[PDB]
Amino acid sequence: HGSVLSNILVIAKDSSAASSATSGLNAYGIPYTTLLVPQAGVGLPALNSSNVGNYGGIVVAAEVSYDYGGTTGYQSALTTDQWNQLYAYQLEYGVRMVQFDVYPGPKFGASAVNGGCCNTGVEQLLSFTDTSDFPTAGLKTGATVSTEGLWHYPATISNSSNTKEIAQFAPNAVTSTASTAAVINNFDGREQMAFFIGFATDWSATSNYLQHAWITWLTRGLYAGHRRVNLNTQIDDMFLVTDIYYPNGSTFRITVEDMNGISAWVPTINAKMNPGSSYFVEVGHNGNGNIEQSSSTDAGAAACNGGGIEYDSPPDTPLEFKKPLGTGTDLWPSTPTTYDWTVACTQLDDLLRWWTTPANRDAFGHISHTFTHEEQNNATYADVFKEISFNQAWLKQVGLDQAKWFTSNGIIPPAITGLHNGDALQAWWDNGIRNCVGDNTRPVLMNQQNAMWPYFTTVESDGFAGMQVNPRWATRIYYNCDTPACTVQEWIDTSAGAGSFDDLLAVEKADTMRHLLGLRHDGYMFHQANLRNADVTPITVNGVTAKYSIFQAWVETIVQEFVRLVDWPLVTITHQEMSENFLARYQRDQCGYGLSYAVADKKITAVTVTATGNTCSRPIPVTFPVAPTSTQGYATEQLGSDPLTVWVQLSGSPVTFTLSTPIAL
Ligand SMILES: *[C@@H]1O[C@H](CO)[C@@H](O[C@@H]2O[C@H](CO)[C@@H](O)[C@H](O)[C@H]2NC(C)=O)[C@H](O)[C@H]1NC(C)=O
Ligand SMILES: *[C@@H]1O[C@H](CO)[C@@H](O[C@@H]2O[C@H](CO)[C@@H](O)[C@H](O)[C@H]2NC(C)=O)[C@H](O)[C@H]1NC(C)=O
Ligand SMILES: *[C@@H]1O[C@H](CO)[C@@H](O)[C@H](O)[C@H]1NC(C)=O
Ligand SMILES: *[C@H]1O[C@H](CO)[C@@H](O)[C@H](O)[C@@H]1O
Ligand SMILES: [Cl-]
Ligand SMILES: [Cl-]
Ligand SMILES: [Cl-]
Ligand SMILES: [Zn+2]
Ligand SMILES: [Zn+2]
Ligand SMILES: [Zn+2]
Ligand SMILES: [Zn+2]
Ligand SMILES: [Zn+2]
Ligand SMILES: [Zn+2]
């Protein structure tokens, strides 16, 4: 008999060391406790009480080792007796331990082949050779990843009766033979997973890939948490004309032929994803671009009340400019006070008639990008109020708000502007707008307490309080580019860019895997000029030659690499749904939810969900590696080969689930 709390104990020397272990647990939502061990030492928390174990797993980074000088040399800052308490806890309560960034020694059942890893720019490929100890992790065996920049130690298992190999360093320029990279130890009942390589989840995509092995193994696939990867790709500036960067003085506006190519390609890329996936492209519209196109001819202008909204744009304010409330000057023409354009006017745009066709509309996501794309950093309430309401009426008249995938309470702010203009945010709020999207290159717009949370505007910092700013990634597929030559040129001119378009896609592949394998649900920023494909020179992406747009080439690169590494689904959700999950994630993290599991004769038989007062506004996710006896009428989730996720709604009493097949320890 006995019970164990599902809290993960993370032991490290400083907050930087612990972050390479807590970031993964935080991404899953797994409750954890951080114990920092200075060189002077520290005492361990209460590991157990009577018949209840306080921790479901232990993670130790670099053996919390310091150089004590003298003949002592490098030693763990935890005493020998403290390490024995941890080993004793592992045995009595069946708790596993993970150690990464450790040197191969007798404590890990291995010895170093003798030497460091690889210097700067020296690659050594790494791959899992046996994933049978953590099958619900969904890692594809044999797929190679990069160790460049991560110091490691090629190792050799010394006694194969207590230590098995799960990862392997490939041969390279320094080494002629493969070697052991990670092991699992069984020391007379004590189970341990040891990684002979450093971790750096802040910059390394490889580290964010590896962490899913030790997290799944440490928890046996059973934990309070949730593993989902969202792939949301937003296309700004639809119906607008954008000035192209490389062939200066040229302009591009997406065409019907271009869009037919994108439509035909969506099922193609869907069939490349693992089972359970579901991808679509979400579009942000500017209604005034539809009126201006229809008014491009003399007779068309007569059909559109003379044309759309027209004004002179002011010079851009400094970034993060907070407009003093009540100031500014209106730019909108005084004559059109309300959206008053004819349906027949809008129909003169070939691109509109395509978008309004139900078969086309219902294959994409739709959200407002303001009517005229007016920058709102220094705009007035009156201007921004019409920027929102006009585009709402246009979306309603044209029928886009009837789409299967539509966002009604959120916008993509134009060029991410007005987020510090209180009068603008109030104009959003006075219409149905409650959330929006930000820019992850501007730290002011990101949550400073937890990356998994959205930022909430404040009266002090933004002139308005309550607007939810969801994060969004930027890419080297730039907003004013329509060809590979363009993006590569702007990447070269405005960055450390160097190489071809494949070189640009290669760095985008690594950076996006770091986001996706880190369970960052942020969307990605693209623009209408990036969809140009109908008339482009064919290029080759991963050996397949086609008339890919720069947007498609990015998605092809990202999706194929994701599928090469894991078998998880890729699920696209609307901006409205994405903002909802960001809010629910933030809210349930304030309830202090926890899990505990009961053990009966060396086997896990049940779990119990709890929170502060056993109540929470939001349901608590619980991941099952074995199906419980009954989901008890709660909302469940199990796409593709994912484990079963049960959203447990706590209402005052703690909920308990019985494992249909008990998990042996
Ligand atoms: C390799 O590890 C195994 C497992 O720890 C060792 O097997 C133990 O051997 C001792 C003495 O021979 C026995 O008292 C234990 O009962 C054994 N344990 C198990 C689980 O079988 C084995 O001796 C090790 N090999 C070497 C060469 O030391
Ligand atoms: C924000 O808007 C205000 C209001 O239009 C700007 O103030 C005007 O600035 C121009 C400079 O071109 C002056 O000629 C006007 O006299 C100013 N009017 C008032 C009422 O102050 C302000 O410059 C804008 N700031 C930014 C950064 O764009
Ligand atoms: C923790 O469990 C051990 C047995 O493994 C026991 O000896 C010890 O007293 C417990 N700690 C408590 C009750 O504080
Ligand atoms: C519980 O589930 C396992 C497989 O998930 C079975 O092997 C067992 O018999 C029980 O049905
Ligand atoms: Cl037609
Ligand atoms: Cl319809
Ligand atoms: Cl770069
Ligand atoms: Zn835009
Ligand atoms: Zn601008
Ligand atoms: Zn944009
Ligand atoms: Zn990025
Ligand atoms: Zn598969
Ligand atoms: Zn076991």
Author numbering: 142 to 806
The authors write:
Galactosaminogalactan (GAG), an α-1,4-linked linear exopolysaccharide of galactose (Gal) and N-acetylgalactosamine (GalNAc), is essential for A. fumigatus biofilm formation and a key virulence factor. Lastly, GAG is partially deacetylated by the secreted protein Agd3 and deletion of agd3 abolishes this modification. Herein, we show that A. fumigatus Agd3 has a unique three-domain architecture and that the enzyme specifically deacetylates α-1,4-GalNAc oligosaccharides in a metal-dependent manner. Agd3 has a novel carbohydrate-binding module (CBM) that extends the substrate binding groove, increases activity on soluble GAG, and influences the location of deacetylation within oligosaccharides.
To gain insights into the function of Agd3, structural studies of the predicted globular protein, residues 141–806, were pursued. Agd3 crystallized in the hexagonal space group P 61 2 2. Diffraction data were anisotropic with diffraction limits of 2.6 Å in one dimension and 3 Å in the other two dimensions. The structure was solved by Zn single-wavelength anomalous dispersion and refined to Rwork and Rfree of 19% and 24%, respectively. Agd3 has a unique compact three-domain structure. The N-terminal domain, comprising residues 141–364, adopts a mixed α/β/α-fold (α/β/α-domain) with a seven-stranded β-sheet at its center. The central domain, residues 365–733, contains the CE4 homology region and has a distorted (β/α)7-fold (CE-domain). The C-terminal domain spanning residues 733–806 forms six β-strands in a seven-stranded β-sandwich. The N- and C-terminal domains increase the stability of the CE-domain, as constructs lacking one or both of these accessory domains expressed poorly and could not be purified to homogeneity from either E. coli or Pichia pastoris. Mapping surface conservation reveals a highly conserved electronegative cleft in the CE-domain. IcaB has only 5.2% sequence identity to Agd3 and aligned poorly compared with the other CE4 enzymes with a RMSD of 3.80 Å over 134 α-carbons. The catalytic cations of these CE4 enzymes overlapped with a Zn ion in Agd3, suggesting that Agd3 is also metal dependent.
